[PDB]
Design a protein around this ligand. Structure first.
Ligand SMILES: *[C@@H]1O[C@H](CO)[C@@H](O)[C@H](O)[C@H]1NC(C)=O
Ligand SMILES: *[C@@H]1O[C@H](CO)[C@@H](O)[C@H](O)[C@H]1NC(C)=O
Length: 348
């Protein structure tokens, strides 16, 4: 009970957790498992107390009877808000943007249209819109929904890659990294800017960044924000400035999760742990850093500024929100989780 057992996924996280444990003087200790699903099970089973999960996993742990403890507060990825512990920063906005000059285009007029995605299986670029598209329709065949798309990471033979176009030489088509020209936020946005796609699924921050002189890239630079609208779920459209009222869903901050019975205590422990090892912590560079990893995002995301208070005791569905929940629930209906299945079994 006094200790808090963390669940690491992989040897790289395991190693980092071991150094944490050591430095914490054994108040934090570590269970390791091969998959995230396996950790949620350990926690469900009381053999581990906590770990930190992404949105899809919060949903799934949520359904199995786990709850969010502290939210991972971003910085912006560099830059500013404060103070970090008391207020959770909202979490970025997934938007669907289309050219203003195209007005015969709405959230309900997207079938057989052309789509530009950031990547397959990303939150803003894939998971939220396709999750919601299939809410709209009731089919799991979102793959057949757009006539053509650029969805980096999908099958290159398929319609979902038909719009990607690799790099200068056309090489590495539909690859899920920067080498694919319409990869990521910028690329998805360029895909719409050059009218290769009808709709681009990005975040609010994306059009601001590539319009009106934020970017100098030859494709971006003479771009105008005027020229782009946002597709809201009420079927209307609005300017890019109004993302807060015209988005698909919020992309959830990663969060620590726990048995409700243990939430108070793991919380209490981590607040002190980050005072020791967090961004201003007594001991960070000096002995150990909670939000730095020798590889990438081990245990927490590297751009995490602190763990922050919920205020308080939200369920998963109140943490994620109705749109995000509808989104993921739709995805998981279409491609099941063994764990979600397991959690619905009447033998647990
Ligand atoms: C949208 O993004 C821009 C750039 O990050 C920011 O200035 C603005 O506050 C954001 N708007 C909303 C509604 O979050
Ligand atoms: C889901 O579908 C209903 C009708 O099917 C719609 O009115 C509602 O806005 C949709 N919800 C989301 C979160 O997209």
């Amino acid at each position: 009970y006094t200790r808090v057992v963390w669940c690491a996924v992989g040897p790289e996280e395991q190693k980092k957790c071991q150094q944490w444990s050591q430095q914490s003087g054994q108040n934090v200790t570590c269970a390791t498992a091969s998959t995230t699903d396996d950790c949620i099970v350990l926690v469900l089973k009381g053999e581990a107390d906590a770990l930190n999960l992404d949105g899809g996993y919060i949903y799934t742990a949520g359904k199995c009877g786990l709850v969010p403890v502290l939210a991972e507060n971003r910085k912006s990825s560099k830059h500013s808000s404060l103070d970090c512990v008391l207020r959770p920063t909202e979490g970025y906005l997934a938007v669907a943007v289309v050219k203003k000059a195209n007005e015969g285009l709405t959230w309900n007029s997207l079938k057989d249209k052309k789509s530009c995605h950031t990547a397959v299986d990303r939150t803003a670029g894939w998971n939220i819109p396709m999750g919601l598209i299939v809410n709209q329709t009731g089919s799991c065949a979102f793959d057949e929904f757009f006539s053509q798309s650029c969805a980096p990471g999908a099958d290159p033979k398929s319609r979902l890659c038909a719009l990607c176009a690799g790099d200068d030489q056309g090489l590495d088509k539909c690859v899920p990294n920067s080498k694919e020209k319409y990869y990521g936020y910028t690329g998805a946005f360029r895909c719409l800017a050059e009218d290769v796609g009808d709709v681009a699924f990005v975040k609010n921050d994306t059009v601001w960044e590539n319009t009106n002189g934020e970017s100098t890239a030859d494709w971006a630079k003479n771009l105008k924000r005027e020229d782009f609208r946002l597709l809201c779920l009420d079927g209307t459209r609005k300017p890019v400035t109004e993302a807060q009222s015209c988005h698909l869903a919020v992309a959830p901050n990663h969060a620590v999760v726990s048995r409700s019975d243990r939430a108070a205590h793991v919380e209490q422990v981590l607040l002190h742990q980050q005072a020791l090892f967090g961004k201003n912590g007594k001991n960070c560079p000096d002995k150990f850093c909670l939000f730095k990893s020798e590889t990438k995002n081990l245990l927490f995301n590297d751009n995490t500024e602190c763990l922050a208070k919920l205020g308080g005791r939200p369920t998963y569905e109140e943490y994620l929100g109705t749109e995000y929940v509808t989104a993921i629930a739709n995805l998981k209906k279409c491609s099941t989780s063994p764990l979600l299945e397991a959690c619905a079994f009447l033998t647990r």
